[PDB]
Each structure stands twice: as C-alpha cells, then as structure tokens.
C-alpha cells in the first residue's frame, strides 16, 4: 500500500553519504591507491532527491513527517560531506546541491527549537556552513546566512556558544563587505542582527572587523532598487545592538562621526518605519551617554525638539529610548541650553 516517498528520498541520501564516508576513509592524506576515484553527486541523482526534499520542506506537515524520519541529520550530513570532499568548488552541481540542502535546513530549523539545537550540535557541519560564506555563489551565501539567521534566533545556551565558537559572526561581517547583491546582503545582515543580540563577544567581534563600522553606518543611507527598507532596518538594528560597546570606545565613536552617523540617525526619527525609529532611538540612548563631544553635537542638531515628539508613544522601545536619550542630553547640557542661561 503506502509509498513512503519521503523515506525513499532520505534513504538515497543516507546511502550516498555512506559511500562518501567510505571513500574518505580510504583516501586520507597518508594514502593508499587512487584506483578508486570519488563518488560524484551527479552520478547518483542527488540534486533531484535533495531538491524534492527542499521543496516539500516549505510545507509544515511535511516537515513534521521528515522530523520523524530524521531528515535534518541526513540533509546536514549530505551538505557537510560535499563540502569536506570538494572544498570551495565552483561546480554547478555541488553548488546547487549545497543550496537545496541549505534551504531545506533553513526550513527545518524555522520555528523548531529541537532542530536548531540539533543542527548546532553537529560541529563538523557548522564549520562547513560557515566556510561556505566564502563561496563565489552569492546565491549559496544567501542560503547559508539564512540558516545561520534561524539558528541564532532564540538559540539556547549551547547553540549560542557553538555559533560563537565556529567563527560565525566574524565570517558573516566579512561576507557583508564583499556582497554585491541585495537579497544576499539582506540575509547576511538579518543573521548578524540576531547574533549581535547574544553577548558582548559577538558585539566586540563585529566592531573589530576592518571596514565594519564604516560599512554599517553606510547601510543607514542605502539606496534600494527593491523599493524596500530592509537593509536600513537590519544594518541599523545591528548598530543599535553593538552601540552599547561603541559608547565606551572613542576610536569607534570617531568612525561613526567621520561618516555623519549622528546626523543620519536623527533623520531616522522622522522615518515612516517603526523599526527604523526604534533602532535609532536605542542607538542614541547609548551614544548620548557619557561622551561630551557627541552630547553637544546632538544639541547643535536640535535632537531635543525631535526626541520630545517621541516620549509619548504607545511603542515601549520608542518611549524608553527617546526618554532615556533625552534625559542624558538634559542632565548634561552645553551652557547655552541650560535653564539658568537662555530661558
């Protein structure tokens, strides 16, 4: 009767991996004969199978069925092994296989805590994923970022640790600098946004990349042909999260200033997107604290009228962030704007 269509797809994938593993065990560096060349994924119809699994993974019912059959392990194993075998290849079959595999993993980690945990526990795969950010396929990078994004969203303690340990933050930030396509960059930044919320080390590792803060401030005035605000919302959200670290560092503060950050950030308080506002409010909350030059430069661009608008908003993060930023500016005035003078 019952076809077990999905089971048969996973068996193919499991089988191919066993064969690759067998080839890896024979063909190590201290090596025996090369009278057995590698398994090639084209020769065992692997794209088709992973492709169909990828397709089915969009639907939630199918995901539930895969999860009973251990589909996540299987697909992650497949991705890992094709990376470990063929490196940073350009072959279309390997890149397509890797993409489909990654998309399936994006879908299987979406909304599922057990799977996020599980995939993160697979450390050889995590390393393989992170290394793919250096691929020449930005379409693949877009996928890998998307995986990393979902793993970093509500990561438990272990998953967070692992994500840091495999060098994900520093690799995505370097990835971002080189990305030429918008869709790719959206995912890269979305992942970084999630990751920057985790811990100090991640914030630190972002700021510590050559061109990073320059680039991030640049995203705040990104010109989209997509007629979309998602790059500004993401890059701004990253900046807001790292700004706690920037606040207390002058070298970094300086890089913002020489790219007109605070000027731009004030224009964001106007902006129509509640996200762009919330981001700019929380960024200023930290940059308006305990630094005299920036404190005054904000007075001299009329931040106080601007922040007075927002203090009575129903949106808590706008209300807090603008009030807090205002309070810093109030309680540390240039003489000119004191109550005693100029009433």
């Amino acid at each position: 009767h019952h076809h077990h269509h999905m089971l048969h797809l996973l068996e193919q994938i499991r089988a191919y991996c066993e064969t690759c593993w067998e080839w890896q065990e024979a063909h190590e560096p201290g090596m025996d004969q090369d009278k057995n060349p590698m398994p090639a994924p084209v020769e065992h119809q692997i794209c088709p199978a992973v492709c169909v699994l990828m397709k089915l993974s969009f639907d939630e019912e199918h995901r539930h069925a895969m999860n009973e059959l251990g589909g996540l392990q299987a697909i992650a194993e497949l991705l890992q092994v094709d990376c470990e075998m063929y490196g940073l290849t350009n072959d279309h079959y390997s890149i397509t296989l890797r993409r489909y595999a990654g998309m399936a993993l994006t879908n299987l980690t979406f909304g599922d805590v057990a799977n996020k945990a599980t995939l993160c526990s697979m450390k050889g795969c995590m390393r393989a994923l992170v290394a793919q950010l250096k691929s020449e396929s930005e379409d693949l990078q877009q996928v890998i970022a998307s995986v990393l994004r979902n793993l970093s969203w509500r990561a438990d303690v272990n998953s967070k640790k692992t994500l840091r340990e495999v060098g994900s933050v520093k690799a995505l930030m370097e990835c971002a600098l080189e990305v030429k396509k918008e869709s790719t960059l959206k995912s890269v930044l979305s992942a970084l946004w999630n990751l920057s919320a985790h811990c100090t080390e991640n914030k630190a590792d972002i700021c510590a990349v050559d061109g990073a803060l320059a680039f991030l401030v640049g995203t705040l005035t990104y010109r989209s042909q997509t007629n979309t605000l998602a790059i500004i919302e993401s890059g701004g959200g990253i900046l807001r999260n790292v700004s706690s670290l920037i606040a207390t560092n002058e070298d970094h503060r300086q890089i913002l200033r020489e790219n007109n950050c605070l000027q731009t950030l004030l224009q964001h308080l106007k902006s129509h997107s509640l996200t762009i506002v919330s981001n700019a409010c929380g960024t200023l909350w930290n940059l308006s604290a305990r630094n005299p030059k920036d404190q005054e430069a904000l007075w001299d661009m009329g931040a106080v009228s601007m922040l007075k608008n927002l203090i009575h908003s129903k949106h808590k993060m706008i209300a807090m962030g603008s009030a807090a930023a205002l309070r810093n500016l109030m309680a540390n005035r240039p003489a000119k704007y004191k109550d005693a003078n100029i009433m």
Binding site: T106, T109, F110, S146, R149, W153, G237
Partner: peptide, 7 residues
Amino acid sequence: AGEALAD
C-alpha cells in the same frame, strides 16, 4: 531580524 523560511 527574527526567523524565516528560505527564499
């Protein structure tokens, strides 16, 4: 950024 399905 939250979580999402694959594009």
